[PDB]
Design a protein around this nucleic acid. Sequence first.
RNA 1: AACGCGACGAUAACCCGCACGUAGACGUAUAAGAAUAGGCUCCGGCCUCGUAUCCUAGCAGGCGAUUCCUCCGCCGG
Lengths: 204, 174, 108, 67, 170
Amino acid sequence: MSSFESVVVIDGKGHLLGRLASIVAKQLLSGQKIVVVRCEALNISGEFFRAKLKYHAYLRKMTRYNPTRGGPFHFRAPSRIFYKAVRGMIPHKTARGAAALERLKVFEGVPPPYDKKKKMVVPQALRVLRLQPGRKYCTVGRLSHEVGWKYQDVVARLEERRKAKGAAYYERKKLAARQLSEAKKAAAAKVDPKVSEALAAYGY
Amino acid sequence: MGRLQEYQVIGRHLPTEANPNPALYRMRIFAPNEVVAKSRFWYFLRGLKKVKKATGEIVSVNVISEKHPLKVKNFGIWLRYDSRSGTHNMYKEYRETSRVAAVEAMYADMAARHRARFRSIHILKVVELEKTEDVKRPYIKQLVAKNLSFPLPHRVPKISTKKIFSAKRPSTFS
Amino acid sequence: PSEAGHRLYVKGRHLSYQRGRRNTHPKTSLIKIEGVDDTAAANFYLGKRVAYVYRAQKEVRGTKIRVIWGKITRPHGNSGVVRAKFTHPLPARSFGASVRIMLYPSSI
Amino acid sequence: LPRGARTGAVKKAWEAYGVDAKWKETNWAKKQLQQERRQSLTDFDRFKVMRLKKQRRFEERKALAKI
Amino acid sequence: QKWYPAEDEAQPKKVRKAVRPWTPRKSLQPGTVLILLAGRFRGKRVVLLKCLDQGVLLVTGPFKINGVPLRRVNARYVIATSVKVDLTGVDQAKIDEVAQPKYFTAASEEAFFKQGEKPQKKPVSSTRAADQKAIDKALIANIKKVDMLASYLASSFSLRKGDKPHLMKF
RNA sequence: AACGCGACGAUAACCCGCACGUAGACGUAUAAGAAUAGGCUCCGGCCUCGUAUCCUAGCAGGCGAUUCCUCCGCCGG
């Protein structure tokens, strides 16, 4: 509800490409630091061949004399595909626009300093809350792999190891919730019931 | 058009020494306010008869309200709409609680489904099907059917549009 | 030890000036207060003192902190943004900078 | 409930079934009651909340170290 | 007066703006706990003794609880709360004495030789110290009666994460 | 990539003199995964809702008690 945070990290899984980009670009220009995680798990609406058509039309556009300078640099990674969408919504030719792009960070997968943090979600760009159930959708990761990304198996192996470490962490988190409920019930016998009567009325 | 009302408009030709006590016509008009109800009255009347605004006068305008706007009625509307080919008849059916809600849903339907505007639709007759088994459309008969009860799959939550970020992923089972 | 804060202000950001498409008027400045989403919530913050604190790289009064003071005048839009007037207009480079909204003058 | 029941029949069915009683027992009304007690908390009342939660958690921390 | 007017400096028109008394807000009742918002005592929880003229309020801490002496503050620089402590036993005659506006308002060798020096902070007057004690002694006794009121007045108001003042009630 | 990045090898500790101490902190607290025509779980039950959960009293936070084994930090192993 219009909260101000130091750095907000967004899980890109199940998120529409342009609708997440317009939210992020508005946040970046307002002064909010944005880290986008799991860019390969982003979603594009329509069908897969339309996205494959659109990138091959993008892949058709190049400069004549030499593509090293002045040519459209076609990026095959999912993170840079998302970065291209955000940059088009930003006045990057100006100094205000470049400072906003410096506030953005995009990664394929969940890197080790950001798997320890709480990844938020944007309900205005989530696919299950926005797309009609019968309609088709594609995934940016399989778009990028079939156009030149060579690190899909690397990311999938690194995501598999993160789930195993996450699964063991959840068992410890499950045990800590056990011990907290056992302690709360036990401490409630000696908790001076004039205190607990007043806290119940106050909401707590 | 908006909060439509239904008006009873009584009009007549201006009285004359040769023709005293004129014919005193009446029409039911669905209009947003009074000044278009009077305008639509003289539009139709000059189409049928010779009487016009300069040679006529408005005797009375009275709004008409529903007998029971809290009971659910099945309404059948016969209408005549003008397209790029010509004039065609339709019999459409809608399920509302009022006659102005009947034509409100009609104009939204004809605009959405046939790209018809207000000046092309002629509301011929609006009737209330007083008894069932006179409903003849399959979508309305589907709602009339016995012990009707449906679930509501994939209800999106109402999340405030200024709450940009949320921590927990939403559920669609309520 | 207290281990508490000393915040008596509400956080806000400086979005932009008042503008159309190609015409900006720097005398009035648009502020997004943290937590306000409507015109009804913005109405509480009208006529509140507004401060924009920044740093100098030179001590002038024994301190490196200079402040520009203003007030919230009227709401803006439907989303809870207010527009504020300062004694000197805020720079341009501060688009996106922190802005403190004080709780005085008070009618609570 | 019959279909098309007027205000008299629905009122007599509400009183017979006692749906005011079973709404109060629902988890949604307990949540709604708790969040109404949130906003009624005055500045003094929020301070006593902080003090009594500190008193409550002194025992809960002690029990957790025992467990 | 003494001098005939030497220039064309004209006397002003008769101004029809009469001084009518300030009506305070309904919340500003004597005994109401206030929150100071500015000054060197910002964020302090004080009590209000008497509402004075032209938008100022007479305020004590009491000094043995939080540390704010008998002071005046502006009404607009104060958040008023719902908690009210009983004024029974507090000397009204001493309040009327400290409500008078003069109570708070008021070349040689030595003059030249302290130039540029920071003047020493004045120790507190014995009249103001005694006037504080005659007021707070019945106030503190009334304060001790209500549970956790003394610690509430010793503490300082602060805003935390998610505290929205447009919905918070005091 | 000459204004992308990594691993590694060897370096610059002295003595004499002098110039100054934030593209936006203010609690800048919060890790399951996965499904969304389902899921979580003490296996009792629970899920529209983060309107949540921790922390938050003390000269910008003193001094000394009564009293408490709770929380925080530094070094090691």
